[PDB]
Amino acid sequence: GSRRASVGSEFMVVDVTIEDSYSTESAWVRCDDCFKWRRIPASVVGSIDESSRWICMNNSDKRFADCSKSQEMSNEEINEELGIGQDEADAYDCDAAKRG
Ligand SMILES: [Zn+2]
């Protein structure tokens, strides 16, 4: 038996701005009532931000414009979409290497 294993590596891109404008056209907005992610167009993203507050019922849609409705995408999809680290959790893992 020629058992063989391996693993990946660590590499990514680097931005030059603060976390306040992800994606290209469409943007991501969180509800200030139920705390749910909502994808909106760049056309409304520059209009709903009049009070720094957004809600489901405030959404441009009709079937997905309400706190009673459901989410548009999964946390995993959103996390990978923006490239953030959703779900803090214990976060317990190896790190013997430490910073340095
Ligand atoms: Zn909501």
From Swiss-Prot:
Binding site for Zn(2+): C31, C34, C56, C67
Descriptive protein name: Histone-lysine N-methyltransferase ASHH2
Effect of W54A: Loss of histone tail binding
Tissue: Ubiquitous, with higher levels in young tissues, including shoot and root apex. Expressed in ovules, tapetum layer and microspores.
Family: Belongs to the class V-like SAM-binding methyltransferase superfamily. Histone-lysine methyltransferase family. SET2 subfamily.
Task of the protein: Histone methyltransferase involved in di and tri-methylation of 'Lys-36' of histone H3 (H3K36me2 and H3K36me3). Binds to H3 already mono- or di-methylated on 'Lys-4'(H3K4me1 or H3K4me2), but not to H3K4me3. H3K4me and H3K36me represent specific tags for epigenetic transcriptional activation. Positively regulates FLC transcription to prevent early flowering transition. Required for flowering transition in response to vernalization and for the maintenance of FLC expression in late embryos, but dispensable for the initial reactivation in early embryos during reprogramming.
Assembly and oligomerization: Interacts with FRI and SUF4, two components of the transcription activator complex FRI-C, and with SWC6, a component of the SWR1 chromatin-remodeling complex. Interacts with BZR2/BES1 and IWS1.
Zinc finger (CW-type): 22-75
Induction profile: Not regulated by vernalization.
Localization of this protein: Nucleus; Chromosome, Centromere
Effect of disrupting the coding gene: Early flowering. Pleiotropic developmental effects including dwarf and bushy phenotype, reduced seed setting and defects in ovule and embryo sac development. Altered responses to brassinosteroid (BR).
